[PDB]
Design a protein around this ligand. Structure first.
Ligand SMILES: C=C/C(=N\Cc1c(COP(=O)(O)O)cnc(C)c1O)C(=O)O
Ligand SMILES: C=C/C(=N\Cc1c(COP(=O)(O)O)cnc(C)c1O)C(=O)O
Ligand SMILES: C=C/C(=N\Cc1c(COP(=O)(O)O)cnc(C)c1O)C(=O)O
Ligand SMILES: Cc1ncc(COP(=O)(O)O)c(C=O)c1O
Ligand SMILES: [Mg+2]
Ligand code: NA
Lengths: 428, 428, 428, 428
């Protein structure tokens, strides 16, 4: 449960030791409730005033959700975590907790298409936040984009689907020198990469993906390392008395957990992007097998890459350590326990033959998701990144002929068998 | 399912006739999935490009949630509905869909404390929206607050816990004359009041409360009447080509459902406050008995009021048709099928004896919720409205001595008995 | 929770007051767990030895399931209840708990088709129990069938679908004088009839039906009145030391609850017909509206009967108080709060026109169930009672032309409207 | 999905390819319904008469449960499977399908205590079946116990907790030569052992254990290999016309699936030990990681065995391949992919020091279960096998000082640490 225990021990125990005291239930109960009876009038007031911890209302906190949050925090070795309705909500909250109208964010370009559209369109239109996209393959572009309005630097661990890996430590040094935190979306690399150990201050997850692992539940997570000093004047909301809580100071009351505390008391309570206790239950079950699944995902993915490189129908193949990958060196440096499950390739004939490939699949699933146990395929340019212009797609690494694979944990020969027949048919 | 069928028939059938065609399941299945397999590449492209309706990803839409959405729409006689993670998210989305940084909102003052804090602080700090609180008990106050930056007028059906009822028709005329829609929070009066029949253009619900009815699940709903013309120049996002969808015009493509459509394609997709399919399943079950429960709720409330008015320990009692209610006339006009389940009262001895009353309850539950099947009690000044200053509390109708009851559907004799013993103990 | 509180108060509170002590969750949590951590080695031993109550293993007992059991017991005013996988399982356990190879059961003939087949075939072939079916419309037939091997007398409250009602008190007098308990399947009449107030010793329910009320979940319940003396020598398994529990005597240890206690420690533990915690959660929600739904069911049923009596397409109509019903007097005597939701009728043209009626329904659902909120229809001779010979069907009240309705809680005008169009098509 | 695909591919796809056709949901929906709308009167009649397959009623079959059933059958390469409420119910149904009053079963003695109690007491008292327990470590004991009343031979793969492994092939030869099937309880060895490849005809599982893998859900499975000829005269119920289905012959109508078909149409339909769709949903998720979890379970168990053998506090250690194990040879021959997760040992000081060991655990959970992801410990003599006499306990391999471990998938260092500290305290 603590930092002394192994990763798999934590994934099975952290946040729920001892078990619930009334009945001793070994599994995390599904507290499908909105409300909780208070001990007395004074207890209720202390709870609402942030003077005592406890459960008040499922929008703000819930015992099932708390187990997931505390377990994620222990696995990331952070000071606390917060679960929200979706990955999008986690990214939105992570930004909104330290940024507002007029503020800026410096973001990498290897982004999931929904993150780009949020940064490029929705956050500007609705929150007045101005995101400056840069080529994070060169840390200098991060440095040169930072202004006095920048509030954070944002990166994806392995670009979806660019498959580029930024130089985390070099970029973190730059962000901290300018007094801003580094935010890392570790959606595609839980367990196999520890962002906090390489300069990241905040980590967000799409729990929907590898953390859940079974494609059953939408969810998002925010994890606070507690390592960042919020008192440099650039984040007064975390320092100054909060009028909505009659003067509470997050840095004073919550100390290293100031950031993740305000995500709950401010953003979750008012904006209301809360996770269902049922979804949290399913995410907890997913965590219990994460390390086993990631190892298989990455073992199979490497074999898929080798198969695609030698197939006559395949124009090109990309993977974080591919010979042609611009950031191959970073991947070798930072990814010591697998290079991810996402594999991209192009089929001879361009976009048109790719569609024949997708339409010929008999086992691989054509759908919008990643990090399911099943192997998945999709054409990002018309789907996950459809919202972006042709040039914006190129900036994220999406080409008109790109096929995106999420290599699952089937027996790899059956994955390869389905790929081969579909590729041969694609050349007809 | 259609407008020809009764309320209860619709509450049992609308949105799910015929049953799911693969197996014929009479109950609404729980589609606890993230993703859906596409027929082919062209099908996937048409879905993502908004050219054909269908299911893409549970963050954006889901078959279980769709049944809830369509059934609520049928019960409200709207053109469409959208389910979100919570009542707060529904309110946030309802505003953000037609308002942004610099824009203004005219809002009533009888607000749930979380709505007030959202309007007063969070929407300002995070979205730059300026909410103008007014005394909605006199329609003139609405008119005089509207400027050329106003995007909507916002009201609660029966103030939580002010118990004031605004003049819906009069305010709707004012909002429409200035070319802005009326948004009505009908959380506390589903079935028993139809805002669309009295000038409202958008309705939001905390489904958490009476719609669910059993205190199991957090949820929110947005209902679009389809009656409002968005083309007067004040809502360009609904008319002009959307850059994020390569030129789609919401009024052109979706006609009467433009508003609720952008709620989904923009706000739900990017901000990510999605509802769980499991929660929607439970809300659907609640709707099937809603009319029966509301009738019982309101019948018990009338008797509880009579009992409290005659008790020696009770300083005052409020209810929408109480003689002393400032908006008694509006309540008599608009509330023809029950005056709600919420009852407020003061105990001799002020705040101190009130706290003893709460602490002496043995059957009524001391918790934060309304619209549960069980009878509930709380002290709003220190709980639901703690975030507000003393003067803001008075503006919402919360007094330091106020006890709020949510009268449940127990046998009324047992409710009265628990009140009586606790009221007598409060005088010791 | 106690006998002092009203039925609806109990339906909202009994078995879960106070709420679960660890978190105070107002809703009954879903303890989807198999196992429970024991305090110590000695605690575990005392639990397994039946020396102390507690939770051991979900096959045997579960906190969510316990609330349902304790709540059902409070509504029936019994000493205890047991939840099982299905109504069939409840009936199977009720019999096997006091009968074995060579023993006899005296049963009425107005039986659900699955109960008849269990009694006539499966319990004989698999347990050696010999069921003696009699015409329970005359209590004398019960008396004359009892032998020294008889272990119980079994009845349905309102025959499904014979719609006959036995003389409960007269039959109870007969059974008790012969030293055997009366078992009553109250599936179709919860709340509206209390068998314990009219001589019944044990009650079973298909929780699937009206108790759930929404057609989501299969479940069964066994309720023990505690009124029957098991020491007359005809039930030594309930008196003698149990070798499997090292000498425990159920009457000595469990006193009035000896019968329901062995159902759990013996039949549930070894035969394993356990209910899921999730299902119990849903039945608990159903109980909270049971009285409201049953009243509506019965109000609508009376109106449907009158409509069918006047329709030109209808050959005949039956209801417990119909002029031609053999047990109209029993129905008038015992059913003081509604006569049930089941209605049977025949259409001119016999069996062939009946099929045309069923196939012409557009709102009433053609499926196998009763006591759903929706109105249902089926042809028992080919479905629920298909397993029975022609003569056995007649003994249960099923005729070749019989259509069975389960009148739901839609607005009655929509039910009648759908009936009318479908009956007219049946005559074409 | 078919026999050509690997085990893990089948574990991810079999039974749900293609996805449900109405919405294409990639995850298996939770069909939490009781009933299904029929196409027409003739369709309903054909279903109930067993003339066409389809869904009728969740007690008998359900689309979510069917996916679990078909996936288990595909993993076992059997002709079909049936899901029931519990492992106990699976064992009960497997026996009752081919046995009745007066019949005999030849069973091994290395049994779970609940199976022993079912065989020794409940099946005798309630079904008149006479189980003859033998020492299955010598196949001759099976041969010499068979009479003309024998209907099956029953074995556990790895005795719980005897840890003995029978000679499956030798016993299967004896059973088949005498014209009776071999039934194998493979609860503790899914994936790692394939009973059908070694003479077994029927396999039963407690899905509760490793198949679920997370201690969330009670469930049982019956798997039919389809290999056994039921027409040798010893099983007339599977050949002769069935009176309850108006002459249907299971061998004639269902061919290789005769046995598993009658389990459903007779035993499940009438005795009613049905599984919840929600539980089945969770079992499907568990299967997706089964091969991963089983490998880790067995790797850790081998290391735990090594650690216990060298600890000064440990009197003895048992494991399927332990030097002192009577069936070490059988274990080496049949178990080529892991020797299970269950490990037993005794502590110096006998029963008294063992209790101190159990009471000193801080990470390993003291509860009644096996095959959870967490490491578990219990004292079988006072818990799982308490119902057995001292002599019966020894015959199953349970000694007064035996501690049973279910080694989970934590990091093995943390498991050893908790064992070590607890063993040291046991010597004080
Ligand atoms: C404890 C919550 C209470 N009320 C919540 C509420 C909300 C928020 O909805 P949720 O986010 O909680 O789902 C929106 N609108 C109205 C009118 C409300 O009363 C209450 O009992 O005072
Ligand atoms: C679909 C089955 C029907 N009825 C079931 C039933 C049962 C069995 O209970 P379950 O196992 O199905 O839960 C027991 N007793 C009575 C009175 C019943 O009507 C029906 O629609 O006619
Ligand atoms: C407490 C239960 C335990 N075991 C149960 C079990 C069963 C019964 O299955 P269920 O009814 O519990 O699902 C059948 N077969 C075997 C081999 C078993 O080990 C245990 O902890 O040893
Ligand atoms: C890398 C990454 N970040 C964020 C998201 C958004 O996740 P969610 O679907 O849970 O909102 C996704 C979804 O594709 C993703 O892949
Ligand atoms: Mg700078
Ligand atoms: Na003792």
């Amino acid at each position: 449960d603590w930092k002394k225990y192994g990763y798999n021990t934590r994934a099975l125990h952290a946040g729920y030791e001892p078990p619930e005291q009334a009945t001793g239930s070994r599994a995390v109960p599904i507290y499908q409730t909105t409300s909780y009876v208070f001990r007395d009038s004074d207890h209720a007031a202390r709870l609402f005033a942030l003077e005592e911890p406890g459960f008040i209302y499922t929008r703000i906190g819930n015992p099932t959700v708390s187990v997931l949050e505390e377990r994620i925090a222990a696995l990331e070795e952070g000071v606390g975590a917060l679960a929200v309705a979706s990955g999008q909500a986690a990214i939105t909250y992570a930004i909104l907790n330290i940024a507002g109208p007029g503020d800026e964010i410096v973001s990498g370009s290897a982004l999931y298409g929904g993150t780009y559209n949020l940064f490029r369109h929705t956050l500007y239109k609705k929150s007045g936040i101005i995101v400056k996209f840069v080529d994070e393959t060169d840390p200098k572009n991060i440095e040169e984009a930072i202004t006095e309005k920048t509030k954070a630097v944002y990166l994806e661990t392995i670009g979806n689907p660019g498959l580029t890996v930024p130089d985390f430590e070099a970029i973190a040094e730059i962000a901290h020198r300018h007094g801003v935190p580094l935010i890392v979306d570790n959606t595609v690399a839980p367990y196999i990469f520890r962002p906090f150990e390489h300069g990241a201050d905040i980590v967000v997850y799409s729990a929907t993906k590898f953390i859940g692992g079974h494609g059953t539940s939408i969810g998002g997570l925010i994890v606070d390392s507690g390592k960042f000093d919020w008192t440099n004047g650039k984040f007064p909301e975390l320092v100054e008395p909060d009028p909505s809580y009659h003067g509470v100071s997050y840095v004073e009351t919550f100390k290293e957990a100031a950031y993740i505390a305000k995500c709950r008391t401010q953003l979750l309570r008012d904006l209301g992007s809360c996770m269902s206790p049922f979804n949290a239950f399913l995410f907890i079950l997913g965590l219990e097998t994460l390390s086993l699944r990631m190892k298989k995902h990455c073992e199979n993915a490497l074999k898929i890459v080798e198969f695609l490189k030698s197939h006559p129908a395949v124009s090109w193949v990309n993977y974080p350590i591919a010979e042609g990958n611009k950031t191959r060196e970073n991947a070798l440096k930072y990814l010591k326990e697998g290079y991810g499950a996402i594999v991209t390739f192009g089929v001879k004939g361009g976009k048109e033959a790719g569609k024949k490939f997708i339409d010929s699949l008999t086992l691989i699933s054509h759908l919008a998701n990643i990090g399911d146990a099943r192997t998945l395929a999709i054409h990002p340019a018309s789907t996950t990144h459809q919202q972006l212009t042709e040039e914006e797609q190129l900036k994220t690494g999406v080409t008109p002929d790109m096929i995106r694979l999420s290599v699952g944990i089937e027996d790899v020969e059956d994955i390869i068998a389905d790929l081969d027949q579909a590729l041969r048919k694609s050349q007809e």
